[PDB]
Amino acid sequence: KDPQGVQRPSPEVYMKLNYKNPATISRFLTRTGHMYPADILPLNPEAVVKLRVAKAQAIRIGLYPRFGNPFWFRSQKFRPKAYQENYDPTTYSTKRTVEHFAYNWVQTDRIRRYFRELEAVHTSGSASARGSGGGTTAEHKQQDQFYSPENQPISLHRNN
Amino acid sequence: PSHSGSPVFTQAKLIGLSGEEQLTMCQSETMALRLCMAKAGKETCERESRALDSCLGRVGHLRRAMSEACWEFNDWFIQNVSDNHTKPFQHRPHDWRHFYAQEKLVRERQQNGHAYGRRPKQFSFGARYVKTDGYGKRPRLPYNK
Amino acid sequence: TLQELIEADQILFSRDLSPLQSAAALSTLQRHLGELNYSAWESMPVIVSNQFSIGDLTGTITIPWDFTPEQFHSFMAHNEKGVARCREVAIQYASTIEQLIAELCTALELDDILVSCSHQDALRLMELLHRNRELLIQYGLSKLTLEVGNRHATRANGVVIINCSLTSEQLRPWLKAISPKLPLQQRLYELSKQMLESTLWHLKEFRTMVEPGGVDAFSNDCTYAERLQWSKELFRIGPSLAPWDWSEMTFVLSPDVDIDWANGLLALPYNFDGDALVRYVEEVQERMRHLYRQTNPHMDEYLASSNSRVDTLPVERPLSHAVTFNSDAEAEDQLKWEGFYAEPYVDQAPTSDIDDMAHTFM
Amino acid sequence: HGNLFYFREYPMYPGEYVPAEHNTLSSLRDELRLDLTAQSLKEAWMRVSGGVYFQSVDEYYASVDGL
Amino acid sequence: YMMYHRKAMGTMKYSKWKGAHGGISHFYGRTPMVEEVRPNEPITLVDRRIMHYVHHSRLRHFQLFRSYQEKSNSTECKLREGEMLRRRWHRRLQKSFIAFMQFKTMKVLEDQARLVNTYGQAAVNAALGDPWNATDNVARERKSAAVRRQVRALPMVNVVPKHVATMKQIHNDRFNYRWRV
Amino acid sequence: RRGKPRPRAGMFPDKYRRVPMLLKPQQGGQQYFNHFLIRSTNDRLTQQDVDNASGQAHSFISPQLPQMDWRNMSARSSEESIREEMRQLAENDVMQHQRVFNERMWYEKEEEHRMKARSPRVLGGDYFKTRFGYSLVKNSEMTQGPVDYSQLDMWGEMPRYTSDMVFLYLVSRRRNTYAVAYTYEGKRILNTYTAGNRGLKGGDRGFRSEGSTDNGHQVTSMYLNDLLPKLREMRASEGRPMGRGEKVELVVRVMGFYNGRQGAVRAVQDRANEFHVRYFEDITPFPLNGPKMPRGVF
Amino acid sequence: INYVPHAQLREHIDKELDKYVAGKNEPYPLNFVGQMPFLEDGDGNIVEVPESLLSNHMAEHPDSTAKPHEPHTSSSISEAAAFEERMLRAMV
C-alpha cells in the first residue's frame, strides 16, 4: 500500500530522531552502521535526510561510533518481527508461503493416512473376529494365500 | 516461459528444492540424532534413525506434491504471466535510458542549462585540509568550475 | 599449592593416629612433602593412614604418616601405573559429573546445580529431572540455582534444596507444594547475587587500595546485609587507612573486635566505627634416576617440554572438544571438524599442478 | 505420529467464512448433538462404531457380506 | 595505506603497524560488531551467524569490491543500478509465484474442507490430534511437552559460501565459479 | 575405449535385464505360509482368551423408545431453555477464524491458562476532544510510565574490559592469515605467526588454499600453543604469576571477510581448554571513499 | 524563559557545575542523552561511577578509587514499595 516509502517512521519517531539519542538512530541503521537501501527499507525522504544529518552530527561530536550500532539488540523490539508461526499474506519471500502450503498439505495427508490406517485396522480386526476360515473367501485362500511382493516379501533390495 | 521477454533460467530455485534455501523439518529429531551420533555412546542409534525415518516418511509425498504444483505453476505462467520473448528486457541499466536521461535533464536545468551528463572533478583524499589558501577545496558543479 | 587443601578442608585426615605424632608429621610434611605433589593430588584427596595403598574408594589413595620424600618418590615410581589409572578414573568421574550437571542446567536455563550427596543417587535424580524436564517448564521452577541434599528445604539466599531420593509419583505433590514459594526464591536469588557481586567488588577494591595481607568475610556465618555493610565500611575507611601499610595483618569478620600487633590479625564486627578505628591508629602513632629408569623405561626415550620458556620445537597440545552439544549446528560443526563428512579419498596430486598449468598457459 | 512442524491457522481469505451454526471445535468427548444432521451422525458413528467408513452403501453391503 | 588496502598490516622487518592495540585501541571506535560470548553459545556459531548476516545483507560483497581493487564511479553506478533492476525484476517474478502458491494453499484448504465434510468435524479434529483420549492431565501434558520442545527455534543461519581467488581477480566479490562480465 | 573415459555404470543397461522379476529375489518358502498363518491364528486365539479372562467380550443393545424423552422435550420447549440456547448461538455466531483443531492454538491457550494458574462517570467525547495530548497517547507506541535505564545507557551492549584479558587479533586476507596476541597495555607478547612465517604460504594448493580455513586454523592453533607458555612466563616476570591451572581470559578480535576466519575461530574453540573466551568482536574498515586503490584488470 | 544575565553568570555557572556533587537526598537529573554520568565532587575529581561503566573505569586506570554510584531509591512515591524493599533487605 506504501511502495514509495512515505509511511514510516511514526511522527513521534520523527520528533525523537535527533543526534542526541542513538537508540532511535540505530532502529533504521544496519548492524554495521550503514543505511538500509530504499529497496529493503523505504524510509521517507525526510526520514533519510534527518537520519543522515543526525548520524553525521553524532559521529562528529562523538555520541555515535563510526561503524556499528550500540543499540542493535535493544532496537529489535521496535523492529518488526516476521513470526514463522503466524503467516503474513504480503510476505516478500516465497519460502514463508511454501512452508505454510506444505504444512496444510501435510495436515491433509495426515487426515487421509489416519483414516486409511483406521480402516485397515478395523478390517483386519473384523476378519480375525469372524475367523481365518470363515472370513477369507475360497479364491483368497487358494491363490492370494502365499508369500508375494505384496504379502510379506523378503527384502527386495541388495546390501541388507 | 519468458517473463518480460526474458526466459526463466531456473525454476527450481523458486521452489527451493536441491538448493541452499531449503525447509527445516523435524529439527528436534535431527538434532537428537546428530547429538547421539556425535557422542561416543555404546551402540549405533538405530532407534533415533527409526524416529527420524518415521518423521520424514511423508517428505517424499510432500516433495512430489510440490513438484506437481510447480509444474502447474509453470503451465499457468506460460498461459498468462509472460509474453514468450516478446517484450524488451527490463533488467539492465541500458534498458532504462529514459530515467537516467531525465536525471541528466534535471541536473542540466539546475546548472543553468550548460553541462549535460557531466560530473564534478575528482578531488584529493584530503583536498579540503591539505590545499593551501587561494585554492578551491570543496568541488564545484561542472558549470561553476 | 599445599595450604589451599588445608584451608578448604577438602583434604581428608583420618584421626585414628596419635594427635601429637600426627601434628609432627603434618609439620614436617608441610615443609618438605609439599613440593613433590603434582597438580592433581589437590583435586584427589589423600587419606592419611599407617601404610601406603592405592585403590579402595575411586579417585582416592592412602599415604602413611611419618613418610619420607625419598620413600614417597620410590612408592610413586613403583606404583606409577596404578596412580596413573587412579588419576584417569578420577578425572573421568569429575568430567562426567560436570557434564551431567551442565546438560540439566543448560536445558532448564538455570545457573548452577550443586551437590552434597552420593553422585550415583544424584545421577538418578538428574535423569528423573531430565525425563520430567518439560513439567518443570510448565511449573514456575526456572532461573533458580539448585542444591542436591538429603533434607527437603529451601535456603533464604534464594536457592532450593532437593532430596536425592525422589520418584515420579512423589514429584508432582512436591512441585505443587513448592510452587507458591518459587516467586519469592527468584527475587531472593537475584538480590543475593547483586549483593554478593557488590561485596566482592568492595573487597577487591579494599585489597587494591589498602594493600593488606588479606580480607576474609565468608569465614563466619553472617547475613548478606551485614556483609555488605562491613564491605562498604571497609571501602569507606580505606582512604583513611591508606597512609599506613597493612600487608602484615589480615582483616577478618567476627562478632568480636580483636586487634593483634604481635600477630597480624584484625577481627571486626559488621557495625564498627571506622572513625574510632582511625583515632585508635593515630593514638598508636643418581639413585633416584637409576630407580626411575629401572622401574619405567619410557622416560629414557620420551622428552618433556618446558612450561615457562618456549622450546625451539613447538609441539601442539591435543585439542579439546565439547562433551555436550546444545545445537544441531554445533553437532554438525563438530562432525565437520572431526572429518566425519570428509571424502575417504587420499590425495595423490595437489592443486599446485593445476595452478602451474594455468600459469604456463598464461 | 505427529507433524513435521507446527504453524498457526492460515489467514481467512476475503469472502471466506466458517458456515453458520457449525461447531468448528467439537471434540470426541463432547455431548452428542440432539439434532439429526450429517455431521452429527458421522461424529456419532465415529464415536460408537469406530473408524469404519464406506464411500457407498454398496461398499457397506459388500463389507457386511450379503445383508 | 588504508586499513583495507592490500598491503595493509603487512609483516616485514621495516614495517611497523600503526595505531595502538589492546584496551582502548585503534578499532575501539571503529568496531562494527561486538557480541558478549556466553556459555552454551559457541563462538564458532556466533561467527557463523555474523558472517551469514554480512553475506545475506550483500555487505561483504561491497566491502571486498571497493577494498581490493579500484573501480571507477561509472562502473560502481552501473553495477549498483544493474543489481537494483535485477532485484526489482526478481521481486516482480516472485510475486506471481507467491500468488500461485496462495491459490494452491486455497485448493489444499478446500480439500481439507472436503475431508471434513466426508468424515465429520470431530473425526477430523481427532485425526489432527485433539486430546480426546486425555483422561488425566498427564496424557495432554505429554503432547504439551512434545510441542514445547518443538517450539524451540534453533538459529536458522546457514553456512556462508566460500570465496574463490581467481587469477588476476577480475572480480573480487566473486563467490562462485560461474563467469560474470 | 578409443582413448576416452569409461562411461559410468548407469549408462550401461541393466546387468540382469534378462531375468524375470520373480527370480530377483526368489520368494521360496511358500510351504511355510499356511503353517505360519495357522500358528498366528492359534496364538491370536490364545491372546484373545487372555483378554477375555482379563475383561469381558460381551456387547449388547439398548432398545430406546422415543416417547420416553417427552420430559426432555417439554424442558427444551420452555422459554428459559430457548433463551440460553439462543444466548449460546449468539455467542458462537461471532466471526471465527479457527477452521479446524490446531495444535498450535491448543498449546498456546493451555500455556496461557497455566501461566494464569502460576500467577463512576465515563469520560466524554468533548473531554477527549479538549484533551489533545490523550489523542497522541492513544497512538504513541512509546514507553509509558517507569522506564529501565538499560534501554537508555549507550554502553550497556558495549563490552566490559579488565586489565587481565589478552586481546587476540585474527587477521584474514586473500592469500594469508595470521594471529597476534597483545596485553591490555598493548605489548606484543609473541611474534606474529603468518602463513609465510609458518611455511604454509607458497607450497602445495598454491594461490587457492593460502587463505583457506585450513591454513588459518593451522597457523592460529600453532600461535596459541606457542603463545601460552610465552604468556605464562611474561606474567611471571611481570610479577602477577598465573594460578594453578587458571583459565586465561581471551578477547577475540577478528578482521577480514575471507576464508581464514572459520578456521581461526574453530582453532580458538579447540584450544578453549585453557583459553576462556570472554568477548568476541569483529573489526572491518568499511571503505566510504578514500585514495585510489591499485588498478584492476577488468 | 529567562536568559542568563551577565551579573549572575558566575552564580549560574556554579549551580550548573554543582548539579553533580556526588551527594544528594534526591535523584540526579539525566543529561541530554538520558544517561547518568560520573558523579564528581568539588575541585574536579571523579569519585562515583555508575555500575555500567564501573568495570571500564577500573580497567582503564587502576588505583583510582571510586564508589559505585547507586541512584536514590524512591520511597516518597509509594510507601508500600519502601516497606517491601526493606522487608526484602531483611529477608536477604
Coordinates of N, CA, C and O in Angstrom, one line a residue, chain E residues 2-9 11 17 21-23 25 27-28 31-37 42-44 46-47 50-51 59-60 62-64 66-71 109 112 116 121 125 128-131 140 143-144 147-148 151 160 162-163 165-170 172, chain F residues 99-101 103-104 106-107 110-111 114 155 157 159 161 167 169 171 173-174 178 180 182-186 192 194 207-208 213 252-253 255 257-259 261-262 265-266 268-269 277-298:
Chain E
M2 N 45.4 2.6 3.3 CA 44.2 2.4 4.1 C 44.2 1.1 4.8 O 44.9 0.2 4.5
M3 N 43.4 1.0 5.9 CA 43.4 -0.2 6.7 C 42.9 -1.4 5.8 O 43.2 -2.5 6.1
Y4 N 42.1 -1.1 4.8 CA 41.5 -2.2 3.9 C 42.4 -2.4 2.7 O 42.0 -3.2 1.8
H5 N 43.5 -1.7 2.6 CA 44.3 -1.8 1.4 C 45.0 -3.2 1.4 O 45.1 -3.9 2.4
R6 N 45.4 -3.6 0.2 CA 46.0 -5.0 0.0 C 47.3 -5.1 0.8 O 47.5 -6.2 1.5
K7 N 48.1 -4.1 0.9 CA 49.4 -4.1 1.6 C 49.3 -3.5 3.0 O 50.3 -3.0 3.5
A8 N 48.1 -3.5 3.6 CA 47.9 -3.1 4.9 C 48.2 -4.2 5.9 O 48.0 -5.3 5.7
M9 N 48.6 -3.7 7.1 CA 49.0 -4.7 8.2 C 50.1 -5.7 7.7 O 50.1 -6.8 8.2
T11 N 53.6 -7.6 7.4 CA 54.6 -8.0 8.4 C 55.9 -8.1 7.6 O 56.2 -8.9 6.8
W17 N 53.4 -1.6 12.5 CA 52.0 -1.4 12.5 C 51.6 -0.1 13.1 O 52.1 0.2 14.2
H21 N 47.0 -1.0 20.1 CA 46.1 -2.1 20.3 C 45.9 -2.4 21.7 O 46.7 -2.0 22.6
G22 N 44.9 -3.2 22.0 CA 44.6 -3.6 23.4 C 43.8 -2.5 24.2 O 44.2 -1.3 24.2
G23 N 42.8 -2.9 24.9 CA 42.0 -2.0 25.7 C 41.3 -1.0 24.8 O 40.5 -1.3 23.9
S25 N 41.8 0.9 21.8 CA 42.6 0.6 20.6 C 42.2 1.4 19.4 O 41.4 2.3 19.5
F27 N 40.8 0.3 16.8 CA 39.5 -0.2 16.4 C 38.4 0.0 17.5 O 37.3 -0.4 17.4
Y28 N 38.8 0.7 18.6 CA 37.9 0.9 19.7 C 36.6 1.6 19.3 O 35.5 1.3 19.7
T31 N 34.9 -0.6 15.7 CA 34.4 -1.9 15.7 C 32.9 -2.0 15.3 O 32.1 -1.4 16.0
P32 N 32.6 -2.6 14.2 CA 31.2 -2.7 13.8 C 30.3 -3.6 14.6 O 29.1 -3.3 14.9
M33 N 30.8 -4.8 15.0 CA 30.0 -5.7 15.8 C 30.8 -6.2 17.0 O 31.9 -6.6 16.9
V34 N 30.1 -6.1 18.1 CA 30.6 -6.6 19.4 C 29.5 -7.5 20.0 O 28.4 -7.1 20.2
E35 N 29.9 -8.8 20.3 CA 29.0 -9.7 21.0 C 29.6 -10.3 22.2 O 30.8 -10.7 22.1
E36 N 28.9 -10.4 23.3 CA 29.4 -11.0 24.5 C 29.1 -12.5 24.4 O 28.0 -12.9 24.6
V37 N 30.2 -13.3 24.2 CA 30.0 -14.7 24.1 C 29.8 -15.3 25.5 O 30.5 -15.0 26.4
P42 N 28.4 -21.4 21.3 CA 29.8 -21.4 20.8 C 30.2 -20.2 20.0 O 29.3 -19.7 19.2
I43 N 31.4 -19.8 20.1 CA 31.9 -18.7 19.3 C 32.0 -19.0 17.8 O 31.9 -18.1 17.0
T44 N 32.1 -20.3 17.5 CA 32.0 -20.7 16.1 C 30.7 -20.4 15.5 O 30.5 -19.9 14.4
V46 N 28.6 -18.1 16.8 CA 28.5 -16.7 16.8 C 29.1 -16.1 15.5 O 28.5 -15.3 14.8
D47 N 30.3 -16.6 15.2 CA 31.0 -16.1 13.9 C 30.2 -16.5 12.7 O 30.1 -15.8 11.7
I50 N 27.2 -14.2 12.3 CA 27.7 -12.8 11.9 C 28.0 -12.9 10.4 O 27.7 -12.0 9.7
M51 N 28.8 -13.9 10.0 CA 29.1 -14.0 8.6 C 27.9 -14.2 7.7 O 27.8 -13.6 6.6
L59 N 26.8 -7.0 2.0 CA 27.7 -6.0 2.6 C 29.2 -6.4 2.5 O 30.0 -5.5 2.1
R60 N 29.5 -7.7 2.7 CA 30.9 -8.1 2.5 C 31.2 -8.0 1.0 O 32.4 -7.8 0.6
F62 N 30.2 -5.6 -1.1 CA 30.6 -4.2 -1.4 C 31.9 -3.9 -0.7 O 32.8 -3.2 -1.3
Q63 N 32.2 -4.4 0.5 CA 33.4 -4.2 1.2 C 34.6 -4.7 0.4 O 35.5 -3.9 0.1
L64 N 34.6 -6.0 0.0 CA 35.6 -6.5 -0.8 C 35.8 -5.8 -2.2 O 36.9 -5.5 -2.6
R66 N 35.0 -2.8 -3.1 CA 35.6 -1.4 -3.0 C 37.0 -1.5 -2.4 O 37.8 -0.6 -2.7
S67 N 37.3 -2.5 -1.6 CA 38.6 -2.5 -1.0 C 39.7 -3.1 -1.8 O 40.8 -2.4 -2.0
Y68 N 39.6 -4.2 -2.4 CA 40.7 -4.9 -3.0 C 41.2 -4.1 -4.2 O 42.4 -3.9 -4.4
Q69 N 40.3 -3.8 -5.1 CA 40.7 -3.1 -6.4 C 40.0 -1.7 -6.4 O 39.0 -1.5 -5.7
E70 N 40.5 -0.9 -7.3 CA 39.9 0.4 -7.6 C 38.9 0.3 -8.8 O 39.3 -0.2 -9.8
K71 N 37.7 0.7 -8.6 CA 36.7 0.7 -9.6 C 36.1 2.1 -9.8 O 35.9 2.9 -8.8
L109 N -6.8 -26.1 1.3 CA -7.8 -25.9 2.3 C -9.2 -26.4 1.8 O -10.0 -26.9 2.7
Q112 N -9.1 -30.0 2.4 CA -9.3 -30.3 3.8 C -10.8 -30.1 4.2 O -11.3 -30.9 5.0
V116 N -13.3 -32.8 5.8 CA -14.1 -32.5 7.0 C -15.6 -32.9 6.7 O -16.3 -33.5 7.5
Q121 N -16.7 -33.3 11.7 CA -15.8 -32.3 12.3 C -15.0 -32.9 13.4 O -13.8 -32.7 13.5
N125 N -10.9 -33.4 13.8 CA -10.2 -32.9 15.0 C -9.4 -34.0 15.6 O -8.2 -33.8 15.9
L128 N -6.5 -34.7 13.6 CA -5.5 -33.7 13.8 C -4.8 -33.8 15.1 O -3.8 -33.0 15.4
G129 N -5.3 -34.6 16.0 CA -4.7 -34.8 17.3 C -5.4 -34.1 18.5 O -4.7 -33.6 19.4
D130 N -6.7 -34.0 18.4 CA -7.4 -33.5 19.6 C -7.2 -34.3 20.8 O -7.3 -35.6 20.7
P131 N -7.0 -33.7 22.0 CA -6.8 -34.5 23.2 C -8.1 -35.1 23.7 O -8.5 -34.8 24.8
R140 N -2.4 -35.2 28.2 CA -2.2 -34.0 27.5 C -0.9 -33.3 27.8 O -0.4 -32.6 27.0
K143 N 1.8 -34.4 25.2 CA 1.7 -33.7 24.0 C 2.1 -32.2 24.1 O 2.8 -31.6 23.2
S144 N 1.8 -31.6 25.3 CA 2.3 -30.3 25.6 C 3.8 -30.2 25.6 O 4.4 -29.3 25.1
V147 N 5.1 -30.5 22.0 CA 5.1 -29.2 21.2 C 5.9 -28.2 21.8 O 6.5 -27.3 21.1
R148 N 6.1 -28.2 23.2 CA 7.0 -27.3 23.8 C 8.5 -27.5 23.3 O 9.2 -26.5 23.1
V151 N 8.7 -26.2 19.7 CA 8.7 -24.7 19.5 C 10.1 -24.2 19.6 O 10.4 -23.2 18.9
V160 N 28.0 -20.0 5.1 CA 28.3 -19.0 4.1 C 29.0 -19.6 3.0 O 29.8 -20.5 3.1
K162 N 31.9 -20.0 0.2 CA 33.4 -19.7 0.2 C 33.7 -18.6 -0.8 O 32.9 -18.2 -1.6
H163 N 34.9 -18.1 -0.6 CA 35.5 -17.1 -1.5 C 36.5 -17.7 -2.5 O 37.4 -18.4 -2.0
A165 N 39.5 -17.4 -5.2 CA 40.5 -16.4 -5.6 C 40.9 -16.8 -7.0 O 41.9 -17.5 -7.2
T166 N 40.2 -16.2 -8.0 CA 40.6 -16.4 -9.4 C 41.8 -15.6 -9.7 O 42.3 -14.7 -9.0
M167 N 42.4 -16.0 -10.9 CA 43.7 -15.5 -11.3 C 43.5 -14.0 -11.8 O 42.6 -13.7 -12.6
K168 N 44.3 -13.1 -11.2 CA 44.3 -11.7 -11.5 C 43.1 -11.0 -10.9 O 43.0 -9.8 -10.9
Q169 N 42.2 -11.8 -10.4 CA 41.0 -11.3 -9.6 C 40.3 -10.2 -10.4 O 40.2 -9.0 -10.0
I170 N 39.7 -10.6 -11.6 CA 38.9 -9.7 -12.4 C 37.7 -9.2 -11.6 O 37.4 -8.0 -11.6
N172 N 36.5 -9.3 -7.5 CA 36.9 -9.7 -6.2 C 35.8 -10.2 -5.2 O 36.1 -11.0 -4.4
Chain F
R99 N -10.5 -22.7 11.7 CA -11.1 -23.7 10.7 C -11.3 -25.0 11.4 O -12.4 -25.5 11.4
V100 N -10.2 -25.6 11.8 CA -10.2 -26.9 12.5 C -9.4 -26.8 13.8 O -8.8 -25.8 14.1
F101 N -9.3 -27.9 14.5 CA -8.5 -28.0 15.7 C -7.0 -27.8 15.3 O -6.5 -28.4 14.3
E103 N -3.0 -27.7 16.8 CA -2.2 -28.0 17.9 C -1.5 -26.7 18.5 O -1.3 -26.6 19.7
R104 N -1.1 -25.8 17.6 CA -0.5 -24.5 18.0 C -1.5 -23.7 18.9 O -1.1 -23.2 19.9
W106 N -4.1 -24.9 20.6 CA -4.3 -25.6 21.8 C -3.2 -25.4 22.8 O -3.3 -25.1 24.0
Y107 N -1.9 -25.5 22.3 CA -0.8 -25.3 23.1 C -0.7 -23.9 23.6 O -0.4 -23.7 24.8
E110 N -3.4 -23.4 26.3 CA -3.1 -24.2 27.6 C -1.9 -23.5 28.3 O -1.9 -23.5 29.5
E111 N -0.9 -23.0 27.5 CA 0.2 -22.3 28.1 C -0.3 -21.0 28.8 O 0.2 -20.7 29.9
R114 N -2.0 -22.1 32.1 CA -1.1 -22.5 33.1 C -0.3 -21.2 33.6 O 0.1 -21.2 34.8
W155 N 26.3 2.3 26.8 CA 27.4 1.4 27.0 C 26.9 0.1 27.6 O 27.8 -0.7 28.0
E157 N 25.4 -2.5 25.9 CA 25.8 -3.5 25.0 C 27.3 -3.6 24.8 O 27.8 -4.6 24.3
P159 N 31.3 -3.9 25.4 CA 32.0 -4.9 26.3 C 32.6 -4.3 27.6 O 32.9 -3.1 27.6
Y161 N 35.7 -4.4 29.9 CA 37.1 -4.8 29.8 C 37.7 -4.9 31.2 O 37.3 -4.2 32.2
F167 N 44.1 -9.8 24.3 CA 43.4 -9.5 23.0 C 44.1 -10.2 21.9 O 45.2 -10.0 21.6
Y169 N 44.2 -10.8 18.0 CA 43.8 -10.4 16.7 C 44.0 -11.5 15.7 O 45.1 -12.0 15.6
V171 N 43.7 -11.8 11.8 CA 43.6 -11.2 10.5 C 43.5 -12.2 9.4 O 44.4 -13.1 9.4
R173 N 43.3 -12.6 5.2 CA 43.4 -11.9 3.9 C 43.1 -12.9 2.8 O 42.7 -14.0 3.0
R174 N 43.3 -12.4 1.6 CA 43.0 -13.2 0.4 C 43.9 -14.4 0.3 O 43.5 -15.5 -0.1
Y178 N 46.9 -14.5 9.8 CA 47.8 -14.5 10.9 C 47.1 -14.1 12.2 O 46.2 -13.3 12.2
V180 N 47.9 -12.6 16.2 CA 48.8 -12.0 17.2 C 48.0 -11.8 18.5 O 46.8 -11.8 18.5
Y182 N 48.0 -9.4 22.1 CA 48.5 -8.3 22.9 C 47.9 -8.3 24.3 O 46.9 -8.9 24.5
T183 N 48.6 -7.6 25.2 CA 48.0 -7.4 26.5 C 47.2 -6.2 26.5 O 47.0 -5.5 25.5
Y184 N 46.6 -5.8 27.7 CA 45.8 -4.6 27.8 C 46.6 -3.3 27.5 O 46.1 -2.4 26.8
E185 N 47.8 -3.3 27.9 CA 48.7 -2.1 27.7 C 49.1 -2.0 26.2 O 49.6 -1.0 25.8
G186 N 49.0 -3.1 25.5 CA 49.3 -3.2 24.1 C 50.7 -3.8 23.7 O 51.1 -3.8 22.6
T192 N 54.4 -12.3 15.5 CA 53.3 -12.7 14.7 C 53.6 -14.0 13.9 O 54.7 -14.3 13.5
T194 N 52.4 -15.7 10.7 CA 51.7 -15.7 9.4 C 51.8 -17.0 8.7 O 52.6 -17.9 9.1
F207 N 47.9 -20.5 -4.2 CA 47.1 -19.5 -4.7 C 45.6 -19.8 -4.5 O 44.8 -18.9 -4.8
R208 N 45.3 -20.9 -4.0 CA 43.9 -21.3 -3.7 C 43.6 -21.5 -2.2 O 42.6 -21.0 -1.7
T213 N 40.4 -21.9 5.2 CA 40.2 -22.1 6.6 C 41.2 -23.1 7.2 O 41.5 -23.0 8.4
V252 N 38.6 -12.2 21.7 CA 38.9 -12.4 20.3 C 38.5 -11.2 19.5 O 37.4 -10.7 19.7
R253 N 39.4 -10.7 18.6 CA 39.1 -9.6 17.7 C 39.5 -10.1 16.3 O 40.7 -10.2 16.0
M255 N 39.4 -9.8 12.0 CA 39.2 -8.9 10.9 C 39.4 -9.7 9.6 O 40.2 -10.6 9.5
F257 N 37.0 -10.7 5.8 CA 35.9 -11.5 5.4 C 36.2 -12.7 4.5 O 35.3 -13.3 3.9
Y258 N 37.5 -13.0 4.4 CA 38.0 -14.2 3.6 C 37.8 -15.5 4.4 O 37.1 -15.5 5.4
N259 N 38.3 -16.6 3.9 CA 38.1 -17.9 4.4 C 38.9 -18.1 5.7 O 38.7 -19.1 6.4
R261 N 38.9 -17.3 8.6 CA 38.2 -16.8 9.8 C 37.5 -18.0 10.5 O 37.6 -18.1 11.8
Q262 N 36.8 -18.8 9.8 CA 36.2 -20.0 10.4 C 37.2 -20.9 11.0 O 37.1 -21.5 12.1
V265 N 38.5 -19.3 14.3 CA 37.5 -19.4 15.4 C 37.4 -20.9 15.9 O 37.3 -21.2 17.1
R266 N 37.5 -21.8 14.9 CA 37.5 -23.2 15.3 C 38.7 -23.6 16.1 O 38.6 -24.4 17.1
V268 N 40.4 -21.6 18.0 CA 40.2 -21.0 19.3 C 39.3 -21.9 20.2 O 39.6 -22.1 21.4
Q269 N 38.2 -22.3 19.6 CA 37.3 -23.2 20.4 C 38.0 -24.5 20.7 O 37.7 -25.1 21.8
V277 N 37.4 -17.8 26.4 CA 37.0 -16.6 25.6 C 35.9 -15.9 26.3 O 34.8 -16.5 26.7
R278 N 36.0 -14.6 26.6 CA 35.1 -13.8 27.3 C 34.3 -12.8 26.3 O 33.1 -12.7 26.5
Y279 N 35.0 -12.2 25.4 CA 34.3 -11.3 24.4 C 34.8 -11.7 23.0 O 35.9 -12.0 22.8
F280 N 33.8 -11.5 22.1 CA 34.1 -11.7 20.6 C 33.8 -10.4 19.9 O 32.6 -9.9 20.0
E281 N 34.7 -9.9 19.1 CA 34.5 -8.7 18.3 C 35.1 -8.9 16.9 O 36.1 -9.6 16.8
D282 N 34.4 -8.3 15.9 CA 34.9 -8.3 14.6 C 35.1 -6.9 14.1 O 34.3 -6.0 14.4
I283 N 36.2 -6.6 13.5 CA 36.6 -5.3 13.0 C 36.8 -5.3 11.5 O 37.5 -6.2 11.0
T284 N 36.3 -4.3 10.8 CA 36.5 -4.2 9.4 C 36.4 -2.8 8.9 O 35.4 -2.1 9.1
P285 N 37.5 -2.3 8.3 CA 37.5 -0.9 7.7 C 36.7 -0.8 6.5 O 37.1 -0.8 5.3
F286 N 35.4 -0.6 6.7 CA 34.5 -0.4 5.5 C 34.8 0.8 4.7 O 34.8 1.9 5.3
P287 N 35.1 0.7 3.4 CA 35.6 1.9 2.7 C 34.4 2.8 2.3 O 33.4 2.3 1.7
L288 N 34.4 4.1 2.6 CA 33.4 5.0 2.2 C 33.9 5.7 0.9 O 33.3 5.5 -0.2
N289 N 35.0 6.4 1.0 CA 35.7 7.0 -0.2 C 37.1 7.4 0.2 O 37.2 8.3 1.0
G290 N 38.1 6.8 -0.4 CA 39.5 7.1 0.0 C 40.4 7.2 -1.2 O 40.0 7.5 -2.3
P291 N 41.7 7.0 -0.9 CA 42.7 7.1 -2.0 C 42.5 6.0 -3.0 O 41.9 5.0 -2.7
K292 N 42.9 6.3 -4.3 CA 42.7 5.3 -5.3 C 43.5 4.0 -5.1 O 44.7 4.1 -4.8
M293 N 42.8 2.9 -5.1 CA 43.4 1.6 -5.0 C 44.2 1.3 -6.3 O 44.0 1.9 -7.3
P294 N 45.1 0.3 -6.2 CA 45.7 -0.2 -7.5 C 44.7 -0.6 -8.5 O 43.7 -1.3 -8.2
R295 N 45.0 -0.3 -9.7 CA 44.0 -0.5 -10.8 C 43.9 -2.0 -11.1 O 44.8 -2.8 -11.1
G296 N 42.6 -2.4 -11.2 CA 42.3 -3.8 -11.6 C 42.3 -4.0 -13.1 O 42.4 -3.1 -13.9
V297 N 42.3 -5.3 -13.5 CA 42.3 -5.7 -14.9 C 41.0 -5.3 -15.6 O 41.0 -4.7 -16.7
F298 N 39.9 -5.6 -14.9 CA 38.6 -5.5 -15.5 C 38.5 -5.8 -17.0 O 37.6 -6.6 -17.5

